[PDB]
Amino acid sequence: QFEERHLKFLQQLGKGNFGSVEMCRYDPLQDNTGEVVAVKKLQHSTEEHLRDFEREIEILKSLQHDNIVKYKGVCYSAGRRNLKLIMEYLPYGSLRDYLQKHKERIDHIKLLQYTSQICKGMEYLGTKRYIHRDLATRNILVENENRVKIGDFGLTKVLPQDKEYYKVKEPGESPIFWYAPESLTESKFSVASDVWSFGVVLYELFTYIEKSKSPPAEFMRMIGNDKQGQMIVFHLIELLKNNGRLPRPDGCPDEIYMIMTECWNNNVNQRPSFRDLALRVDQIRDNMA
Ligand SMILES: Cc1cnc(Nc2ccc(OCCN3CCCC3)cc2)nc1Nc1cccc(S(=O)(=O)NC(C)(C)C)c1
């Protein structure tokens, strides 16, 4: 529905490996009444990346949830590539940056509100047999002080009809300090591996994104900063097989650290569901209030 003639560039919000996101104003009447949107595009539009980009557009079109960023449409230039995905724009940016800028005004009860919203959005993803694979405070976006949203679906894959996991080894470097053990060793991605990663999201939240308490900082202080390249991954695998874990964040109540550890269970069938986590986090929140 969108025409690239009338999309007008304001600034770049983010740029990763295969894609980038720009703030733009859709102003079809050329009079500065149009609305400001977010536009995602590929920056190396190979054909494999393009077909995966279109499955992502189709996945995001199939989702409507208060905690999922809103799809708006697509746009094409002359031809049926240079394809662009149009989404709503959220003014407060990533939850990672929002939280370390207001760390002295956001208490634990507010952290738990975000947490339960993330859970409800993740639970909605699971009902449609989507695996996010990429959850982190980096990709959680902020609509306003009371609402967060899951903000990017570049790696979201749909489960096969028969099986409850997905095997993918990607070319390039992966965020291996959020990945469940069975994802490091066998590249299996399930809703239980997303629960592992939600545990480290919750860890991040309670570290208030303090620089020396990032999961990579803490993990690679546990295995030694001397480790080399591929050996890095191997050493982390061994540390997770011996029940080495991230430490409890400073000030974190023991109840919330028990939720974190229960998601970091080595036994994949023994991790809690997102609906159970939402109920645990809603009761901790209701007792604090
Ligand atoms: C879909 C969408 C809607 N609204 C926003 N709002 C937003 C608003 C301000 C942001 O500030 C970024 C920090 N500075 C960068 C320059 C301006 C400010 C960042 C994001 N972002 C959105 N997506 C987005 C924006 C930046 C990064 C990401 S991502 O890290 O999760 N994924 C990739 C873009 C790398 C694929 C996703």
Side-chain angles (χ1 to χ4, degrees), residues 250-266:
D250 309 324
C252 180
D254 276 293
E255 298 106 58
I256 290 151
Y257 193 52
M258 182 83 182
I259 299 192
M260 287 180 209
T261 52
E262 281 176 31
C263 303
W264 301 328
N265 202 326
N266 277 315

Side-chain angles (χ1 to χ4, degrees), residues 11-17 19-21 38 40 69 87-94 97 138-141 151-152:
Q11 82 180 93
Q12 162 158 108
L13 303 163
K15 175 219 194 142
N17 262 344
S20 91
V21 168
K40 188 184 201 192
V69 71
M87 297 166 266
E88 84 184 306
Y89 166 82
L90 304 181
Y92 288 93
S94 148
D97 292 341
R138 186 177 34 81
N139 36 73
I140 306 265
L141 302 180
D152 196 75

Side-chain angles (χ1 to χ4, degrees), residues 36-48:
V36 166
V37 303
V39 180
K40 188 184 201 192
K41 64 178 194 128
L42 292 187
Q43 292 191 147
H44 194 172
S45 95
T46 88
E47 211 72 20
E48 314 83 21

Side-chain angles (χ1 to χ4, degrees), residues 79-92:
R80 195 156 170 98
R81 62 220 273 252
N82 294 286
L83 172 70
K84 278 157 190 229
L85 166 57
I86 307 312
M87 297 166 266
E88 84 184 306
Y89 166 82
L90 304 181
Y92 288 93

Side-chain angles (χ1 to χ4, degrees), residues 21-288:
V21 168
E22 311 172 338
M23 185 182 52
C24 312
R25 176 195 278 280
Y26 189 67
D27 193 25
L29 305 195
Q30 321 275 358
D31 62 343
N32 256 276
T33 75
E35 48 163 347
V36 166
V37 303
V39 180
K40 188 184 201 192
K41 64 178 194 128
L42 292 187
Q43 292 191 147
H44 194 172
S45 95
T46 88
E47 211 72 20
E48 314 83 21
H49 282 50
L50 204 71
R51 301 196 292 268
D52 279 297
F53 188 51
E54 288 159 354
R55 257 161 297 160
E56 160 190 4
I57 289 160
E58 218 188 349
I59 282 180
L60 183 60
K61 192 177 117 220
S62 75
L63 299 156
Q64 67 118 352
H65 192 277
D66 279 1
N67 301 129
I68 304 264
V69 71
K70 281 178 157 249
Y71 166 89
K72 276 191 143 36
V74 292
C75 155
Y76 321 78
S77 64
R80 195 156 170 98
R81 62 220 273 252
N82 294 286
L83 172 70
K84 278 157 190 229
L85 166 57
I86 307 312
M87 297 166 266
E88 84 184 306
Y89 166 82
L90 304 181
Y92 288 93
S94 148
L95 178 54
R96 186 188 64 180
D97 292 341
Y98 183 82
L99 171 61
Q100 62 182 309
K101 185 205 165 117
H102 302 249
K103 59 212 304 170
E104 311 188 318
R105 297 233 67 107
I106 298 164
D107 58 343
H108 287 9
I109 306 89
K110 184 51 71 146
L111 284 194
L112 294 187
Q113 182 178 17
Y114 302 145
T115 309
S116 98
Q117 290 183 23
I118 293 149
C119 275
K120 293 155 155 69
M122 281 307 282
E123 170 68 37
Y124 178 72
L125 279 207
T127 64
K128 303 204 132 220
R129 285 171 70 71
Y130 297 137
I131 310 300
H132 198 257
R133 208 234 283 187
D134 198 25
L135 192 69
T137 49
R138 186 177 34 81
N139 36 73
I140 306 265
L141 302 180
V142 179
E143 183 153 65
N144 57 72
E145 51 154 1
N146 299 311
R147 189 145 147 210
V148 287
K149 286 179 138 106
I150 293 160
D152 196 75
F153 300 90
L155 316 192
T156 308
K157 254 86 181 283
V158 46
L159 281 167
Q161 297 251 333
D162 41 285
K163 283 258 181 181
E164 289 324 287
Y165 55 73
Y166 196 90
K167 256 170 159 188
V168 50
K169 191 178 226 334
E170 41 77 56
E173 298 75 28
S174 323
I176 61 147
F177 301 97
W178 284 249
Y179 275 8
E182 73 268 13
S183 299
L184 304 181
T185 64
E186 312 169 1
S187 34
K188 280 210 307 223
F189 293 98
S190 64
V191 175
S193 73
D194 275 355
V195 169
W196 177 287
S197 286
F198 168 90
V200 47
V201 156
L202 184 67
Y203 168 85
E204 288 189 277
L205 284 201
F206 275 74
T207 71
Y208 284 86
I209 323 287
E210 193 181 358
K211 65 160 202 81
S212 275
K213 313 300 190 103
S214 78
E218 286 281 0
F219 262 138
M220 213 141 85
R221 276 203 318 262
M222 279 176 82
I223 84 164
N225 280 80
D226 60 285
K227 270 34 176 162
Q228 201 243 355
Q230 181 162 19
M231 287 316 102
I232 303 264
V233 173
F234 185 26
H235 274 99
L236 177 58
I237 284 182
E238 203 73 41
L239 171 72
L240 295 174
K241 216 162 82 200
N242 308 324
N243 213 91
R245 294 294 185 271
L246 292 161
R248 174 179 51 88
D250 309 324
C252 180
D254 276 293
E255 298 106 58
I256 290 151
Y257 193 52
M258 182 83 182
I259 299 192
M260 287 180 209
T261 52
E262 281 176 31
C263 303
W264 301 328
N265 202 326
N266 277 315
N267 303 317
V268 177
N269 72 283
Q270 287 171 5
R271 298 172 197 157
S273 55
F274 280 110
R275 272 177 286 143
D276 280 319
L277 297 167
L279 257 74
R280 272 266 65 215
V281 153
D282 289 346
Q283 198 97 0
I284 301 187
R285 189 156 57 117
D286 261 311
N287 291 349
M288 276 176 180

